[PDB]
Design a protein around this ligand. Structure first.
Ligand SMILES: Nc1ncnc2c1ncn2[C@@H]1O[C@H](COP(=O)(O)O)[C@@H](O)[C@H]1O
Length: 528
């Protein structure tokens, strides 16, 4: 704690005795009849007044079917109005929301539902069969938003419930409200506990204050094509958008053609994106078949854009201001944010990662010594503030090695801050693999591979890739006499995992390089 970095923006007032829903919808009356949630795929619309009232009904409904304060509700849905209504609804009830990609496999879903100890599952009928077995066998209530196969509940039982019967709840600021899963700096997916105070803090750091880090014009329309089941989109787009009363145009499924049409149609002006989608948008031959002049800002994150794409986007969307931010689930998840988006913008440099958010502290430590480093000195990025997670669910050791004794969250990312307080990420210490912006845990794939009868050891590492950034490859030690082939192993994994967790190549070896403790020498592997 010698060299401590902060935002170039002054600290602001942040409520510390308010529940998340009360905070994000605090200034509802100024725009109560204004559009809040718009479903770009079917035109559904919910005004601000509609969301506030329905949230309370969802709370009454949840109670009615037995969901109590502290209970975990699992969402198995695509980005949508229903997702937000279920979330805000759970927040009003004092319940917790955990979410998973609807494209997950039954095994992945059951594991998630089991670990999170979800009492209720909300999804769509086209995904019902993937939870059908697990459901009955675990006495977990299943609910669908469209049809209601078998005996599962319908979502109108929550949205149409009597608000007057919404239970009386005393939400404490330190009560958990969001439970996203993340592998963190090492190992298997773990439950990240995010509190009311934590999230309110994070939203405030991004959009509150006389000179907000992210400024909104009254005519702005923010796009939500990023997945709501990932906290980054639910926070930076939905919660932040609601907080400032902006209309949010949601896209359940990404399709270049429709998106461009939607941008002209609804006058989309703020486009939150990740490198992969931005790259798809940039390669579109139909950019001139649509009026995209309403676009004034391309907000990127999740992974680096790269100098080339950065230049490409800047060239193909001269009407918009391009900027990049940086987040990590356990951090709330926003750590740094592009100050070129502030009401009174600051200059930013190419490749920049943004500036550490206000009402927070950031330092850079020598991964070895642990000493704090000064400007322009690469090291591990650490952040501290009320916005970071409370810890991992039922996993004290994990928490203890991610958040140190002085409250600093260790990201496992290597970067440095320059004289202009702009953060630059240059390397990654943790084993985390990111394919298409999605997180892929080597330990998870490794466990699946090793469970195979003909495999005695395995290691999964990231292989640099143009289209996805990193593709997972696997080094495998076959058991004696095994004649299993690469394709046979790859299909073995593919059947059990969601699309982005497929291993692209299998390299057979006689032994996985390991340190005395058993830690895989991953750089030793990558070095190959
Ligand atoms: N702008 C960025 N540049 C480079 N890496 C990033 C960026 N944003 C996120 N990441 C990486 O993604 C991790 C966050 O993953 P997650 O917890 O799945 O959102 C960070 O710890 C980084 O390793």
């Amino acid at each position: 704690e010698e060299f401590i970095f902060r935002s170039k923006l002054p600290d602001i007032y942040i409520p510390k005795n308010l529940p998340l829903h009360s905070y994000v919808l605090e200034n509802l009356s100024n725009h109560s009849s204004k559009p809040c949630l718009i479903n770009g795929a079917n035109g559904d619309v919910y005004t601000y007044a509609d969301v506030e009232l329905t949230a309370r009904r969802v709370a009454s409904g949840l109670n009615k079917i037995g969901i109590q304060q502290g209970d975990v509700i699992m969402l198995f849905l695509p980005s949508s109005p229903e997702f937000v209504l279920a979330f805000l609804g759970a927040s009003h009830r004092g319940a917790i929301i955990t979410a998973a990609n609807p494209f997950s496999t039954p095994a992945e879903l059951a594991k998630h539902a089991k670990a999170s100890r979800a009492k209720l599952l909300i999804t769509q009928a086209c995904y019902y069969e993937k939870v059908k077995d697990f459901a009955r066998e675990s006495d977990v209530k299943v609910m669908c938003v469209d049809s209601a196969p078998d005996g599962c509940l319908h979502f109108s039982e929550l949205t149409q419930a009597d608000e007057n019967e919404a239970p009386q709840v005393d939400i404490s600021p330190d009560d958990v409200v969001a439970l996203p899963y993340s592998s963190g700096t090492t190992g298997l997916p773990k439950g990240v506990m995010l509190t009311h105070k934590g999230l309110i803090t994070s939203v405030a750091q991004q959009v509150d204050g006389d000179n907000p880090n992210l400024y909104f014009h009254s005519e702005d329309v923010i796009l939500c094509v990023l997945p709501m089941f990932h906290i980054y989109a639910l926070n930076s787009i939905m919660l932040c958008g609601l907080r400032v009363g902006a209309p949010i145009l949601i896209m359940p499924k990404f399709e270049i053609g429709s998106l461009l049409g939607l941008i002209e149609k609804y006058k989309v002006s703020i486009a939150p994106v990740v490198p992969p989608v931005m790259m798809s948008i940039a390669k579109s031959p139909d950019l001139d078949k649509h009026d995209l002049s309403s676009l004034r800002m391309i907000k990127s994150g999740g992974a680096p854009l790269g100098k080339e794409l950065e230049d490409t986007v800047r060239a193909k969307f001269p009407q918009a201001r391009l900027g990049q931010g940086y987040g990590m689930t356990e951090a709330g998840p926003v750590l740094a944010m592009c100050l070129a988006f502030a009401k009174e913008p600051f200059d930013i440099k190419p490749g920049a990662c943004g500036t550490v958010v206000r009402n927070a502290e950031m330092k850079i430590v020598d991964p070895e010594t642990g000493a704090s480093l000064p400007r322009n000195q690469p090291g591990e990025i650490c952040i501290r503030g009320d916005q970071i997670m409370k810890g991992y669910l039922n996993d004290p050791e994990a928490t203890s090695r991610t958040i140190d004794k002085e409250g600093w969250l260790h990201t496992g990312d290597i970067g440095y801050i320059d004289d202009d307080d702009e953060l630059f990420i240059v390397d990654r210490l943790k084993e985390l693999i990111k394919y298409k912006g999605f997180q892929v845990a080597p330990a998870e794939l490794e466990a699946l591979l090793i469970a195979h009868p003909e495999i005695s050891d395995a290691a999964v590492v990231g292989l640099k890739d143009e289209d996805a950034g990193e593709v997972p490859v696997a080094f495998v030690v076959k058991s004696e006499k095994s004649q299993a082939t690469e394709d046979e192993i790859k299909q073995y994994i593919s059947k059990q995992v969601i699309f982005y967790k497929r291993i692209k190549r299998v390299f057979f070896i006689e032994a996985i390089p390991k340190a005395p403790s058993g830690k895989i020498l991953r750089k030793n592997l990558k070095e190959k």
